[PDB]
A paper describes a structure:
During quiescence and in early G1, MuvB binds to the retinoblastoma protein (RB) paralogs p130 or p107 (p130/p107) and E2F4-DP.
We found that co-expression of RBAP48 with the DIRP region of LIN9 (LIN994–278) and the conserved CRAW domain of LIN37 (LIN3792–130) in Sf9 cells yielded a MuvB subcomplex that was stable through affinity purification and size-exclusion chromatography. The LIN994–278 sequence is almost entirely visible in the electron density and contains six alpha helices and the Tudor domain. LIN9 and RBAP48 associate across a broad interface focused around the N-terminal helix (αN) of RBAP48 and the adjacent side of the β-propeller domain. The small structured LIN37 CRAW domain is bound between LIN9 α1 and α2. In contrast, the H4 site is bound by the sequence in LIN9 between α5 and α6 and is not accessible in the MuvBN complex. In the MuvBN structure, the H3 site is for the most part accessible, although the α1 and α2 helices of LIN9 pack against the edge of the propeller where the H3 site-binding peptides exit the propeller face.
Numbering used by the authors:
A (entry chain A): 10 to 209, 214 to 411
B (entry chain B): 98 to 199, 214 to 220, 223 to 257, 262 to 274
C (entry chain C): 95 to 126
Amino acid sequence: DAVEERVINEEYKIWKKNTPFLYDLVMTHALEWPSLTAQWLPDVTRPEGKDFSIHRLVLGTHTSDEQNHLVIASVQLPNDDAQFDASHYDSEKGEFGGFGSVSGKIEIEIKINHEGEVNRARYMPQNPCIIATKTPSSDVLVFDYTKHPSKPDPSGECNPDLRLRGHQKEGYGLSWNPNLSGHLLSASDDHTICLWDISAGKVVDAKTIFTGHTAVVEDVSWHLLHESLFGSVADDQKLMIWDTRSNNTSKPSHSVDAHTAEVNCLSFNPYSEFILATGSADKTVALWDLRNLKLKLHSFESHKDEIFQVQWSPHNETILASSGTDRRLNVWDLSKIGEEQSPEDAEDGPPELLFIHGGHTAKISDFSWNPNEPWVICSVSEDNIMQVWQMAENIYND
Amino acid sequence: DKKASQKIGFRLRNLLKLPKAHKWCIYEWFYSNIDKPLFEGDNDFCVCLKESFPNLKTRKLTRVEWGKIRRLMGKPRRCSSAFFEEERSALKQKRQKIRLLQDEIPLPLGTKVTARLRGVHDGLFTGQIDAVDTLNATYRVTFDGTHTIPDYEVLSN
Amino acid sequence: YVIKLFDRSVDLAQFSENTPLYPICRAWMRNS
C-alpha cells in the first residue's frame, strides 16, 4: 500500500502546484459521506448586481452504518465580473480547496430520507422538482423535493412520492425521457431494463420490461432526439438499441459486441441523431454511429483502468468526457482526431485528448457538466471529495 | 451550545473513519519538513506573473483577465501519466537539492515529530527521532515502536 | 470545546453545525 499511496500523494501535490495553468476555476469540497451520484439541476439564480450565480446539485450519500439521504446542495459560481486570486491553490485560508468564487461554498439545502445508499439520482427534464432514485432494495424511488421537509425525520423513515417496481435486483442505470414527460428507464443487476410512465397506490408497476441482456445491465440512456429509441450496455459486453414501438421486448433493434469486457455506461450525443459513446471495463471509450454499429467509429484509449461514466458536453457537439477508476476524468475533442501534433505533445496522449483532470484522489463515481456554465464540471469520488472545476479557456481555444 | 459542538464532531468522525477520506486529508494538508519549501513558495505561475507582468501588482482579476494572461503564457501540457512521472522525478531532484543544503530552508531534524506510518496502523502518529541517518536520508522514529521513515514523511512537531 | 479523534485534536468551538467539512478537516490536520 505504501508504493501506491506515495505516488498518489506526490502526484496530487504536483497537481495542486500546477493548477493555475490548468483551471479557470477549481473548488474542492469534502462531503460527510461520499456520493455515488452527481447531477446539476437545470435552474440558475443570477442575482442582480452580483459577481456570482447560484446553482443546485443533486447528490446522495453512501454509508452502510448510518442513515442515507438524497441531497440537494447549493453552489455559488463566479461569473465574468468576479475577481479572485487564480494564481495558486488555496488550502489554508478558505472554506473550499483551490481558487475561484469567494462565495463558492457548497451548502446543504435539503436532505431527504432514503432507503439505503443512493445508487443514482436524476431529475426529470420536464419538471426538475422530480428526482428519481435507484435504491439497493431494487425499487426505483421518486421524490418531489419541494414537498419534503428541509430537515429529514431522525427516525430515518423514507416516504417516497412514488415507488417504482419491476426489478428484482439493484442497479445503477437511470434515464428520463427528455421528449416524453414521465417516461423513465432503469437498468438493473437482474439483467433487465424497466420502463415506467409515471404520468399514470403510490406504487407503480413497470409499463414494460426489456430482456435482451444476459448479464448485469450497467447503464441505459434515452436517445435525445427520438422518443422511441434508447440504448443499453451490460456486463455481456454488448450495446443494444431499443425501439419502444416494437412489439417484441425480448430482442433489441440492434445488438453489437461493443467492447472486450464489461460495458458500464453510455450517453447519446445531444446534437447528432446518430452519435453515441460507451465506456468499458476494457479502459476504452468507443464512438458509434447508429447508421452502422458494425464497428466503432473511434476508440479513445488514454484511460488506464475501467471507465465508469461518459457524458457529452451540453454546449459543444464534439466534446465528450469520461471518468474511471484510474482516478482521472478525461475530456475529448472529436474534431482533433486525425490531427498532427508535435512529438513533444504525443507523449501526453492522442490529439483528441483535450484535457486530463488529475484533481481526484480516489475512483471517480460520477460527474455532470453544468448546463448553464459552459465547461464547468462537477465530479465526485469515493474518498468523499466533490470537485467543481473548469478547464482553462486557454486549453479549448486557439 | 455544546449539543452543536458535539454534532459537528459526529460529522467529522464519519468522514475520518472512512480510510479513503482519511488519506485524502494527508494528501491535502500534510507536507513534511523537506517538502514544505518545494510547495509553499511561489509556483511557476506566480514566478511567471512576477517576471513577465511586472506592472501587475494586484492578484484579484476576472476569468477573462486571467485568460488573457494564460494565453500569453502558452498552452499547458496535458496532465499525462508521463507528465506526472517527469514531475515526480523532478521532485526527487528538488529534494536532494534541499537535502545537501542541510538560508530559510528547514533545518535537519530528540526532536518531537509527526510521522506517516502504514500497514497495521495508518495515521500520522507522534514520536521522537531516535536516530538520524543521512545515508538513505531517513530517520528512526520511536512512537509515543521504532521505524525507519523517509524524511519526506516526517513533520517536525 | 476540544475533542480527540484518531491521535489528532481539534477545537470545534470555532465552528458551527453549518460549517462544511473542508475547513474542519484542516484544523484537525494542523498542529500546535
